[PDB]
Amino acid sequence: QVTTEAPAKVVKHSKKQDENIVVNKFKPKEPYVGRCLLNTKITGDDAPGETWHMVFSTEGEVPYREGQSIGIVPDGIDKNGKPHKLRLYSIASSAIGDFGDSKTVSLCVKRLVYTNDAGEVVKGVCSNFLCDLKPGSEVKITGPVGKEMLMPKDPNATVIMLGTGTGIAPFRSFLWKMFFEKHEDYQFNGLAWLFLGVPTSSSLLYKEEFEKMKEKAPENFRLDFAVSREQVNDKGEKMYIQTRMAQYAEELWELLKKDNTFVYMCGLKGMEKGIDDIMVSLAAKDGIDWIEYKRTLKKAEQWNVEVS
Ligand SMILES: Cc1cc2nc3c(=O)[nH]c(=O)nc-3n(C[C@H](O)[C@H](O)[C@H](O)COP(=O)(O)OP(=O)(O)OC[C@H]3O[C@@H](n4cnc5c(N)ncnc54)[C@H](O)[C@@H]3O)c2cc1C
Ligand SMILES: NC(=O)c1ccc[n+]([C@@H]2O[C@H](COP(=O)([O-])OP(=O)(O)OC[C@H]3O[C@@H](n4cnc5c(N)ncnc54)[C@H](OP(=O)(O)O)[C@@H]3O)[C@@H](O)[C@H]2O)c1
């Protein structure tokens, strides 16, 4: 008698792709050092700000999956001569990545530039270090991190993705695995619906890639853009993400009542409110309380949010 089945730790059940998940392999103390392969500005010279797409080599050392983030420790020192603390960035590439070899990672970064009360033009430290990165230079990477935005296991589920600005990042990740990759254990056949809010047309992130996916899966891939400073509803209200969602109110509420519908939200902290406003009315007309229903969805792993 050399064996025994040690009693099992009690565990919560999950509908998301978390099997063999990895978080925090690399710490800021000793980050994984990768190199920049490419770094391109994806917004028009005319857009209010600049957003860049960049790819780093990982030689397969960073075991990330769709929906996770990695931290970046930007080169340099702060005002007190100390190294910079990490900044987190949602991964914009699928687990196998932009080279299809599982040896790279991609980011979608907005260059942060503003002016303080003193009237001084301030440049965000990490975002400017990243957007300035030249191919061939090293970059310190930490993580992976996160389990909230992991894709659902069900390959026939309805996945509603709501994002603003660079919040599109994890959705580009999900969608690559869903429509640009042939997976033995996962071949998506449900309905993927993406809503993306950006300020101008010169700011439409990954527009061409999304259009190729629609041209390849015209049935099960739906795409709706909400250009806030160019588009307007019938009353002249700015077309924010919730204003566009409102044109499909009947349909979305109908999908939300389905049990295989998963909603993901990523981007600005504020997008959260206008959407709940839209949802509270729908449930109300249906004799439902969104406050209680949302609670249920959240616990059922069907209302996933990652905003900052
Ligand atoms: C999980 C997670 C994922 C993220 N994913 C992404 C992503 O994919 N892409 C992305 O670009 N960002 C993402 N971010 C944000 C990112 O981590 C950084 O905060 C961002 O890049 C800015 O950092 P920085 O080092 O450039 O700026 P910092 O040097 O840290 O400066 C930021 C500070 O400047 C001030 N500030 C910022 N904006 C303004 C303003 N408009 N007016 C006045 N003061 C201001 C604030 O005090 C703020 O604390 C994510 C954040 C989290 C938590
Ligand atoms: N995992 C994460 O937590 C994660 C991942 C990626 C990005 N982010 C965060 O999300 C943000 C992305 O910012 P960005 O600079 O890329 O975006 P932005 O370009 O400044 O604007 C995004 C769009 O959303 C609109 N908007 C503003 N307030 C809104 C509101 N309350 N409800 C709905 N829409 C609203 C804006 O309209 P107007 O400009 O006309 O006002 C704009 O069209 C960053 O702050 C980043 O930190 C977080």
Curated annotation (Swiss-Prot):
GO terms for biological process: photosynthesis. Pathway: Energy metabolism; photosynthesis. GO terms for molecular function: ferredoxin-NADP+ reductase activity. Its EC number is 1.18.1.2. It is a peripheral membrane protein. PROSITE patterns: FAD_FR (PS51384). Its cofactor is FAD. It catalyses: 2 reduced [2Fe-2S]-[ferredoxin] + NADP(+) + H(+) = 2 oxidized [2Fe-2S]-[ferredoxin] + NADPH. FAD binds at R87, L88, Y89, S90, C108, V109, K110, Y114, V125, C126, S127, T166. Transmembrane segments: none annotated. It is an enzyme of class 1 (oxidoreductase). Residues 29-151 form the FAD-binding FR-type domain. InterPro entries: FAD-bd_FR_type, Flavoprot_Pyr_Nucl_cyt_Rdtase, FNR, FNR_nucleotide-bd, FNR_plant_Cyanobacteria, OxRdtase_FAD/NAD-bd, Riboflavin_synthase-like_b-brl. NADP(+) binds at S90, K110, T166, V198, P199, S228, R229, K238, G267, L268, E306. It is found in: Plastid, Chloroplast stroma; Plastid, Chloroplast thylakoid membrane. FNR is probably attached to the membrane by a specific binding protein. Monomer. Interacts with TIC62 (via C-terminus). PANTHER family: PTHR43314. This is Ferredoxin--NADP reductase, leaf isozyme, chloroplastic. The lineage of its organism: Eukaryota, Viridiplantae, Streptophyta, Embryophyta, Tracheophyta.
